[PDB]
Amino acid sequence: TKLNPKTREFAFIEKNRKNLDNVIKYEGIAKRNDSIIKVYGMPDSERKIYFESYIAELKKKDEAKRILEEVVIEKYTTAFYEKQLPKTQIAIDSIGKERNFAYYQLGLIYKEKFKEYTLASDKLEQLLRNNPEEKLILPSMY
Numbered sequence: 001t002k003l004n005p006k007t008r009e010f011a012f013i014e015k016n017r018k019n020l021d022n023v024i025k026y027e028g029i030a031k032r033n034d035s036i037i038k039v040y041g042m043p044d045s046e047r048k049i050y051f052e053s054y055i056a057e058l059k060k061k062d063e064a065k066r067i068l069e070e071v072v073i074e075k076y077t078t079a080f081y082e083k084q085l086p087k088t089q090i091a092i093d094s095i096g097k098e099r100n101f102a103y104y105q106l107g108l109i110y111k112e113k114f115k116e117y118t119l120a121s122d123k124l125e126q127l128l129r130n131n132p133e134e135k136l137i138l139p140s141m142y
């Protein structure tokens with residue numbers, strides 16, 4: 001808004017703003033699919049206990065905030081929600097495919113539309129490091 005149009009800097013910032021919705025979308029997709037993959041690699045009740053403790057702490061903080069302004073069932077529901085992992089094998093294959101595609105897209109966007117050459121490096125290296133889809137491997141190598 002403050003930048004004067006027709007300027008080079010205005011065009012640069014406009015391009016960065018435009019190619020940022022894709023960055024946010026693919027980063028969120030990759031992050032959530034990575035979380036799913038890591039939690040599915042070994043679904044352990046220790047993670048359930050830790051998440052329940054954190055949710056209880058958040059409940060206590062919210063109650064304290066409500067007090068300043070003037071549990072067990074929810075813990076069990078959250079534990080059940082942890083049991084909402086995809087209990088198949090084609091589903092996790094699709095999730096891994098989505099994660100790899102998100103990494104590839106993020107690397108391509110960083111290299112091309114941002115000229116980063118650093119974040120794209122880790123993106124493509126991590127994509128190549130975890131069983132790529134055999135179609136992205138060679139373009140990512142290039």
Ligand SMILES: *[C@H]1O[C@H](CO)[C@@H](O)[C@H](O)[C@@H]1O
Nearest residue numbers: 031032034035036039082
């Ligand atoms: C990412 O999100 C999934 C959603 O279930 C979690 O299970 C995982 O532990 C990580 O927080």
